[PDB]
């Protein structure tokens, strides 16, 4: 509270670490469904059903232009990619399985990088 400061983790490396994690995501074999925005003009239903589209290139642009206040807002956007994927894709489809795979991949890197 006022004049009662909580000790805080060193956040000075977060930008570099999130960029590294995103690079590993981008280069993953199963990243192809997520590298660019879904084309709202070519993919029926997507614009109406998915209220907040997100993809790796958009995340990369936001990371590069200071649009994430902290590492938690970065993780929200990454998870939003896979949440959208689950909404629109059957689990037993190529894109659906890709999403599950990339989510697992992300969360381990996230834990290993930032949880002690
Ligand atoms: C992640 C996601 N969720 C719902 C719909 C599409 C997508 N991914 C988009 C990028 C995509 C993937 C596969 C596609 C495609 C486009 O069209 C062009 C070629 C055919 O195959």
Swiss-Prot record:
Residues 9-113 form the Bromo domain. It is found in: Nucleus. Expressed at varying levels in several tissues, whereas a smaller transcript was expressed specifically in testis. Component of the BRF-1 ISWI chromatin remodeling complex, at least composed of SMARCA1 and BAZ2B, which regulates the spacing of histone octamers on the DNA template to facilitate access to DNA. Within the BRF-1 ISWI chromatin remodeling complex interacts with SMARCA1; the interaction is direct. Component of the BRF-5 ISWI chromatin remodeling complex, at least composed of SMARCA5/SNF2H and BAZ2B, which regulates the spacing of histone octamers on the DNA template to facilitate access to DNA. Regulatory subunit of the ATP-dependent BRF-1 and BRF-5 ISWI chromatin remodeling complexes, which form ordered nucleosome arrays on chromatin and facilitate access to DNA during DNA-templated processes such as DNA replication, transcription, and repair. Both complexes regulate the spacing of nucleosomes along the chromatin and have the ability to slide mononucleosomes to the center of a DNA template. The BRF-1 ISWI chromatin remodeling complex has a lower ATP hydrolysis rate than the BRF-5 ISWI chromatin remodeling complex. Belongs to the WAL family. This is Bromodomain adjacent to zinc finger domain protein 2B. It comes from Homo sapiens. The chain holds residues 2054 to 2167 of 2168 of the full protein.
